[PDB]
């Protein structure tokens, strides 16, 4: 059995194994970092089944749960938030914070989203690139999702820049473990203090809603509220940064499609749908353990055996998406959903927010900077390490 996670075939490409497995062995065993074996599911139809089957569990203290690193195994010990829950606990807690992420709520947030993107682009203009390229990640891709999610949680304007930097330090590949866990402690301590404040005078933010509607009635206590606020911050932010940077890089590699976006910014939604299919930047989140024996394709998954469902592989499934390895924002979409955001009950709570952010960015970026260009050769883009989720560490641009 091959070791898993697989490495990406190159900087922007998924692992090569998935294509071979989809054609010859779509449900296979892989070897995890700790020698334990797990089942790997690679086809769109089977990913959808894993994501929704009531015989499979996300509870991480069940025997056989497939942790991919040593830190996930100790992370498993902490009191769980709804990302690691099964029904009916899962939706009991998830529904406490879902109101802010509904399509209606996200529609009302659109003016604020546009203003955040506008402001940060204008800052970047004023900084200019008269002394060399600027890092689109640091100047724009990192603060855009960071400022929005922090603001929704209830962080006041003056604290945004410091906390944005701390959260970036958490997941920066060149941080030592001491730097990353200190940045991590910094974030938890700040949220605990903000929870204490909102318990005394609530405002109009997610933490205030949790304090008022759940903590004070006793449905949860303040430490649960900190953990839920922390989950909402860290679950999607690094992914959002990578999607933004990956969109810019992808457009630089497909000049003809960038020219269409420049001449019709209303194509941004369709560009965003294809970006999220093609660059599946969160590909290791759909994991389960089997509560009972369960049949997936021609394999029997025994109870207490772990499953990993690759939505990355599913998004390149030739049986669903014609010419899946071509980036085509003008593609015709089948009936089946792309799985960039997962599937079923656990499907990314922030799907509508994330798409509205991505769509606002790509309908605005090139209207502001019609000559935005990646300043290094495309073969020299600094992608994330090949053993991690696809992403871009830094992206020098001129405009
Ligand atoms: C392009 C950006 C993003 C992508 C591609 C993405 C992707 C995903 C994926 C694949 C999952 C697993 C879903 C499943 O189990 O079926 C997920 C879950 C989740 N995401 Fe996102 N995400 C993004 C942005 C965000 C943001 C901005 C937030 C928070 C503000 C967020 C919060 C969550 C949470 C809380 C879950 C767990 C939901 C649950 O288990 O009920 N994500 N996301």
Length of the chain: 399
List the residue whose alpha carbon is closest to atom 20 of ligand 1.
Answer: 348
- How far apart CA 326 and CA 308 sit, in angstroms, is 25
Q: Does the N-terminal peptide bond of residue 88 adopt cis geometry, omega within 30 degrees of 0? A: yes
Structure tokens at 279: 């660059």
Question: How many A from CA of 341 to the centre of ligand 1?
Answer: 6
Q: What are the structure tokens assigned to 283, written together?
A: 């590909």
Which residue is catalytic, options 48, 211, 276, 348? 348
Instruction: Tell which residue, 12, 5, 17, has the closest CA to residue 42.
Output: 17
348 marked as binding residue: yes
Distances (CA, A) of 73 to 57, 67, 227: 16, 6, 18
287 close to 307: Cβ distance less than 8 angstroms: yes
382 vs 369: CA distance, rounded Å:
22
178 token code pair: 């001491």
* Distance from C-alpha of 193 to C-alpha of 188, rounded to nearest angstrom: 9
CATH of the domain at 151: 1.10.630.10
- Alpha-carbon gap, residue 192 to 188, rounded angstroms: 6
CA-94 nearest atom, ligand 1: 41
Nearest residue (CA) to ligand 1, atom 23: 236
Judge contact between 312 and 395, C-beta under 8 A: no
**Residue environment code for 20-55, b if the CB has 16+ CB neighbours within 10 A, otherwise e:** ebbeeebbbebebeeeeebbbbbbbebbbbbbebee
Q: CA–CA distance from 217 to each of 220, 225, 287 (Å)?
A: 8, 13, 33
Q: Which residues face 290 on adjacent strands?
A: 56
Nearest to 214 by CA among 101, 106, 78, 94: 94
Question: Exposed, middle or buried, 111 (CB in 10 Å: 0-12/13-18/19+)?
Answer: exposed
The structure tokens listed for 129 are 């690139």
Residue 205 CB neighbour total at 10 angstroms: 20
113 φ, ψ (degrees, to nearest 5): -65, -45
The gap from C-alpha 374 to its chain's centroid, in whole angstroms, comes to 24
Catalytic residue chosen out of the listed positions 28, 239, 313, 359 = 239
Three-state helix/strand/coil letters over the chain = CCECCCCCCCCCCCCCHHHHHHHHCCEEEEECCCCCEEEEECCHHHHHHHHHCCCEECCCCCCCCCCCCHHHHHHCCCCCCHHHCCCCHHHHHHHHHHHHHCHHHHHHHHHHHHHHHHHHHHHHHHHCCCCCCEEHHHHHHCHHHHHHHHHHHCCCHHHHHHHHHHHHHHHCCCCCHHHHHHHHHHHHHHHHHHHHHHHHCCCCCHHHHHHHHHHCCCCCCHHHHHHHHHHHHHCCHHHHHHHHHHHHHHHHHCHHHHHHHHHCHHHHHHHHHHHHHHCCCCCCCCEEEECCCEEECCEEECCCCEEEECHHHHHCCCCCCCCCCCCCCCCCCCCCCCCCCCCHHHCCCCHHHHHHHHHHHHHHHHHHCCCCEECCCHHHCEECCCCCCCCEEECEEEC
Residue nearest to atom 4 of ligand 1 (CA): 341
Edge-first strand listing for the sheet containing 56-57: 27-31, 37-41, 306-309, 287-290, 56-57
Ligand 1 pocket mutation pick from 41, 95, 339, 348 by most atoms within 8 angstroms of CB: 348
Cα four-point dihedral sign 388, 172, 144, 105: positive
CA dihedral 231, 99, 157, 391 (to 10 degrees): 50
**Which residue in this structure is represented by tokens 């497939």?**
66
Reported structure resolution in angstroms: 2.1
Q: Which domain holds residue 273?
A: 1-399
The reply to whether 48 belongs to the active site is: no
Q: How many CA atoms lie within 13 A of 93 on its CB side?
A: 22
Q: Of the listed 46, 84, 224, 389, which one is catalytic?
A: 389
Instruction: Give the angle 101-107-110 at the CA atoms, nearest 5°.
Output: 105
Task: Say how many Å lie between the CA of residue 234 and the centre of ligand 1.
Answer: 10
* 172 CA from centroid of ligand 1 (Å): 19
Per the annotation, the verdict on 348 as an active-site residue is yes
CA 217 vs. chain centroid, Å, equals 32
Distance CA 149, CA 270 (A): 24
- Annotated active-site residue 71? The verdict is no
Lining ligand 1 with CB less than 6 A are 51, 82-83, 94, 149, 231-232, 235-236, 239-240, 243, 276, 281-282, 285-286, 311, 340-344, 346-350, 353-354
Report the DSSP pairing between strands 396-398 and 373-374: antiparallel
Around 75, how many Cα atoms within 13 Å sit in the side-chain half-sphere?
Answer: 15
User: Quick check: is 146 catalytic?
Assistant: no
Exposure pattern of 383-397 as b/e (b: 16+ CB <10 Å)?
Answer: bbeeebbbbbbebbb
- What per-residue string of b and e applies to 128-146 under the rule 16 or more CB within 10 Å gives b? ebeeebbbbbebbbbbbbb
Which atom of ligand 1 approaches the CA of 85 most closely?
A: 40
Q: Name the nearest CA neighbour of 125 among 375, 395, 368, 358.
A: 368
Of 306, 308, 307, the C-alpha closest to 284 is 308
Domain count, the chain: 1
């Amino acid at each position: 059995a091959p070791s898993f996670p697989f490495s990406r075939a190159s900087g922007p490409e998924p692992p090569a194994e998935f294509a071979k497995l989809r054609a010859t062995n779509p449900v296979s065993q892989v070897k995890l970092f700790d020698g334990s074996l797990a089942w790997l599911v690679t086809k769109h139809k089977d990913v959808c089944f894993v994501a929704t089957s009531e015989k499979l569990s996300k509870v991480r203290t069940r025997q056989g749960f497939p942790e991919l690193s040593a830190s996930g195994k100790q992370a498993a010990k902490a009191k769980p938030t709804f990302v690691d829950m099964d029904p009916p606990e899962h939706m009991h807690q998830r529904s406490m914070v879902e109101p802010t992420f509904t399509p209606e709520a996200v529609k009302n947030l659109q003016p604020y989203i546009q203003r955040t993107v506008d402001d940060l682009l204008e800052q970047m203009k004023q900084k200019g690139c008269a002394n060399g390229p600027v890092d689109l990640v640091k100047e724009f891709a990192l603060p855009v999702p960071s400022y929005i999610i922090y603001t929704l949680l209830g962080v006041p304007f003056n604290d945004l820049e410091y906390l944005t930097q701390q959260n970036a330090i958490r997941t920066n590949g060149s941080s030592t473990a001491r730097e990353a866990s200190a940045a991590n402690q910094e974030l938890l301590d700040y949220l605990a203090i903000l929870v204490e404040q909102r318990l005394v005078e609530p405002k109009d933010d997610i933490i205030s809603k949790l304090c008022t509607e759940q903590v004070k009635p006793g449905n949860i206590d303040k430490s649960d509220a900190v953990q839920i606020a922390f989950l909402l911050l860290v679950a999607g932010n690094a992914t959002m940064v990578n999607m933004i940077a990956l969109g810019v890089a992808t457009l630089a590699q497909h000049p003809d499609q960038l020219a269409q976006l420049k001449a019709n910014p209303s194509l941004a939604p369709q560009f965003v749908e294809e970006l999220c299919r093609y660059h599946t930047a969160s590909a290791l989140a759909i994991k389960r353990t089997a509560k009972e024996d369960v049949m997936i394709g021609d394999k029997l998954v025994r109870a207490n055996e772990g499953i990993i469902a690759s939505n990355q592989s599913a998004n390149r499934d030739e049986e669903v998406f014609e010419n899946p390895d071509e980036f085509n924002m003008n593609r015709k979409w089948p009936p089946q959903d792309p799985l960039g955001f997962g599937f079923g009950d656990h499907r990314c709570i922030a799907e509508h927010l994330a798409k509205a952010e991505l769509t606002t960015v790509f309908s605005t970026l090139y209207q502001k900077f019609p000559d935005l260009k990646v300043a290094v050769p495309l073969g020299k883009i600094n992608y994330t390490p090949l053993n991690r989720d696809v992403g871009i560490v830094d992206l020098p641009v001129i405009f």
